[PDB]
Symmetry: C3
Amino acid sequence: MTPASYNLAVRRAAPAVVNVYNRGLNTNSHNQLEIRTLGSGVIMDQRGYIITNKHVINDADQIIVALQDGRVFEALLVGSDSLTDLAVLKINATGGLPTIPINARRVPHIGDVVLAIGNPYNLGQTITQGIISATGRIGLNPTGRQNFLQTDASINHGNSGGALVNSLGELMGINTLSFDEGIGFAIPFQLATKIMDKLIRDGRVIRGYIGIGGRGIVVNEVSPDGPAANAGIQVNDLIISVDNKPAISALETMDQVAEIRPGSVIPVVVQLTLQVTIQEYPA
Amino acid sequence: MTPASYNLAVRRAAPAVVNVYNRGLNTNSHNQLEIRTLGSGVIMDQRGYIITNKHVINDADQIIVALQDGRVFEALLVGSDSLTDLAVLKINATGGLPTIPINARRVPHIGDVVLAIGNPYNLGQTITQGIISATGRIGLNPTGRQNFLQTDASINHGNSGGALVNSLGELMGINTLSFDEGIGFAIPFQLATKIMDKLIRDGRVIRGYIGIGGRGIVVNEVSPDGPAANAGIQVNDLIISVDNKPAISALETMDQVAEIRPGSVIPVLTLQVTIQEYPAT
Amino acid sequence: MTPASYNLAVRRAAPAVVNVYNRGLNTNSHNQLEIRTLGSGVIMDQRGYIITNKHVINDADQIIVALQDGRVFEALLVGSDSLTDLAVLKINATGGLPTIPINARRVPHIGDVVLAIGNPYNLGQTITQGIISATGRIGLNPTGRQNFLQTDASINHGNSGGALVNSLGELMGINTLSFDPEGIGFAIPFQLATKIMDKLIRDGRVIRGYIGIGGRQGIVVNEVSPDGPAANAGIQVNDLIISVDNKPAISALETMDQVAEIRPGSVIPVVVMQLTLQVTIQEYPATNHHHHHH
């Protein structure tokens, strides 16, 4: 017979999970480059773009990336995002690079078997398995850990920034050491992809803000003094059209707003059409 | 090729797992119902019965149940049992209720893949995967967590009182934290079912108690003047037969004793013994 | 539609996993064999040899083994090995024994599903599942936890000395509590455990060949310990080894594992760069200092 195994997922995806090293110049008294932090990362494509955790590369003076095939490269930071604890690096790829399998049409399901791939510097590349416990949201509106992907695969320091893949080796998400026990989190791959593209284009993730709450949609708390204030909007009414389409849920409405570029003026129903200019999510 | 997955089990079972909120008036003073303890529960049937843990509902003064589909209900406490940390609730079943898949003929086996489904109101409904490490006894004589079903599927607070199902979505047990590292406990579903019915029938679990720790069956203790001392029972003699059936093993006889109602007199020479309700905990 | 299950692996392998009890005569204040330390062990074959952990049987005044089917036996300590934390026990059972399924041709793969079977006397036989996170090395040459097999199957006190098996019930390794580790367990790869057990059965201890080199179409000497088989012969520091005992000297690790396998006292030819040199291999420097870093 054939022993049950997830080796196919490993062979397919593991070569694209790298070791990421944050090194500093003022870490020791002799001003010699020294490791301050370690982590994992995922090569996204052949141009040399790698996704890792922001907390892994914070304040580094030199970022080194090491691959399983032995190659070592210095990486450049292209940008980071505190809300997702994601950062994007850029290595100068010569001779081709291994890249993570991705299936943009695949829809992750609660209960899908998942493998967490991390290259802890304390024990070599490691793999652990669990399942997807909650799928998380892929929109740009920040809502906290409860909306990241959750899994019971062991996620720890030698995993963080590494990959979460299904049994086919396809990228399900980017492992991230906690947020907000026995449960780990990851940024859904669909959001991790959107964030990387935004970080390459602009050097930061620009989100659309409107300062409103609720749960038609009832404006529960909308007095952040943001845009919703400097326009037609009371602290106790019900909005209808987010812009030109129904405002079912608050969550599924803050995502539309997040994608709206700052400076844009849109029509917020409530039926006195009061226009508002979207701002850039607070620092 | 399709990704390996236990989503089938999830689709079938998760809608039947609910959040349970234990509110309390004499929570801090305004004398207003403040949420004191959260938990999970399993909707068992269309009559609206729900199984959760006894620790979740202790001192509630008001219990609320929220289903994954959004509906919220006030719940009636129909009974609870300390020995198994189970409690039964009942809610309005009018509009139809999602129910947990259950197969009474399904024999659980060590090695079976199981999913632990808990509805914590902090990170939402969470599903974890493991296997059954030990099947546990389904008898009524209380013994201890050791005889409960054991699994390595993460069992925590946002799980406690929730469901443990197999890959078909069928109920294997009810997750319980602890009350007779890496391993969690659950009440086997066959015991949970028997406990729930006894609670519906009498409002409490009534257990037979003879008081003969037979560690044939070699007796070993009958000191608390138990209904054994008050009959033809020594202190270190064996037991060839009880209630008229064989006396093969001790744990299968104690579950048997706990199954006969208190008062009744049966043959245990032969000084017809009288079973008396288990000692109130 | 039958539920997903690893019960088959359980039925084949769990019977071979036993409880091991280590007692001592001066445990209490009455001078009676008092259960000190517990553990698990695995019956490797019908003759009655059993593998368990060294730390479980250390300082044992009497070792007893209890099988799942009830049978209970007193056991003989045939030997142990600190480096791998393994020990071998022997029990005389004339009525047939349940043995662990073993397939010497199976090659373990990273991602293979595994079950950790531990027979503790606190919760009964325990079974947990995970996968192989890293396969580990199988040579005799000392290495430390980093090269044992790694798994996310949970490895604790009630597992140690127990079995790690694949979904067919075949032995992948022997569970061992850490070495050299958060939610990661270690096991001695079965190929290594089998070699160790054979050596313990024959010699009562593991005898490893030593050549005295730390050299990382040839090998580059890094160090040449004082008074070692290499030190006391043609070898100083930057010498290029072409082959040892007339065998292509490709890798340092392969060559070191090859030396560990050579009986001490043997005299072998070591080609360097042309320059043939006769070296008499010694026993591996006796020292329980290997996993300390000190």
